[PDB]
């Protein structure tokens, strides 16, 4: 079975780290930054890594029982998580945390909804601090705060992510700081490895989204390594990787010729020949196409 | 030539609302016109109605916060763009802009803005898709919010979350199409209604229970094709060798095949069944293409 890429414009791609469309391609030097996201992690021969799931609407969602209001802390609610598909959290799993769990620290803004008893429903805005000491999704312990007290204990509860809340303090959004999946008394394990460009003059090519902000000042930048459609496609195809690097061409369909070329590394990230922090803006109908198997030494024309 | 993506039910996305599929479901749909406009694609990849390929975009809106509606209390006038940023073209051969809700109800979600600069703000919001002001085809939609914290003339996005049941707004009717053009306009360029034609068969739906924000509702939202089937058919552009693709639902744990279904060329599935009930199957089961048949192929009941 031959390796293939799905044919997609940038505007048809889905961010694999937050359930919103990709806005632009982006490259960065990543000065002082360790790139180690756990969502959107898949090898090109079909192995999912980190907390990556294939569903494109599920990343950064939570589901669970509303166990209780945290004693003494009004309108702070303790969830007992399940997995997003309904199966119980199993902390013996070989994952950093539950599939789809946020891979960044910050004030995640969204809506907590309930259905029950019966068909009675209710929903209100909520905030989950993925940087807080007790944020421990690996063992199913997550809390959310809400300005509403209209939540019932022991009813099924879902958290739909919307964006990030900026208070202007230590809790501020850091898309490259992994949470402590087990809370403040446990260390992360089974992480997908960090990635970096190893070849001179190359930088990682990211797929960037500007996610919504709920207060304060932020551009909401969320950079993933692969659009969710590439994850889904490699998962489906599980094609044999004939070399360590798949050479991609970003094709202008109006001319048939290359706009630029990129190296898709087998472990699931792309590099380009570029320098600095800036978007990669192209004609809107451009798409990546698989060109050939090459090695890590292949020299790319700069873009 | 023709393939179906290998997906469990829990890995499928509802094509009419951006949530995972909860179950397969079948119904007689007596006295109901089944004519959803999202999740509509032929098996050779032609998108119909308002169907787009992005799985996170259906029921989203974006555009300029034109004004607080004069007279009204905390009503905001959106001037839509298309979800890809391009301008709304009312002469397009669609009933409305791609991704537009295809049901009438009080759609609940969060309206967010960014601007001026990187200043941001977001608050709960709801859009009555049955209101006579709801006219997305010409880019006019209003939302209500308990908050007054919205800047005029800043980019605004509506992220859908669920449905809101209250007496003084339209109840959630998933099979009642909005008037995409506002009060007086007739809908046009609609994907057609679907129904089983062979005796003993019913449509097979992929059902989600979308969140409720208030009131009593089971949030039932039935689509004809999971969004991943839509994306796959769009990618493949494979020629339909007959009018029906015969599919088989199989459990990979045991190799047991559980039932067969008829995937009609124009983009929906039927099974031999009777009554309104979920189709509960082993968790790891999935559909697989078996053969090109016609509309008269007779299935064993499930
Ligand atoms: Cl597979
Ligand atoms: Cl195409």
Author numbering:
A (entry chain B): 225 to 527
B (entry chain A): 226 to 527
What did the publication describing this PDB structure actually write?
Noroviruses are highly contagious, infecting both humans and animals. The human norovirus capsid protruding (P) domain binds histo-blood group antigen (HBGA) co-factors for infection, and a recently discovered bat norovirus (GX) was also found to interact with HBGAs. In this study, we determined the P domain structures of four human noroviruses and one bat norovirus using X-ray crystallography to examine structural features linked to potential interspecies transmission.
The P domains of GII.9 (AY038599), GII.23 (KT290889), GII.27 (MG495077), GVIII (AJ844470), and GX (MF373609) were expressed in E.coli. P domains in a dose-dependent manner at concentrations less than 80 ng/mL. P domains contained most of the equivalent residues that could interact with Fc-NB26. Our cumulative data show that Fc-NB26/NB26 binds most GII genotypes, and the epitope is vulnerable and a therapeutic target region for GII noroviruses.
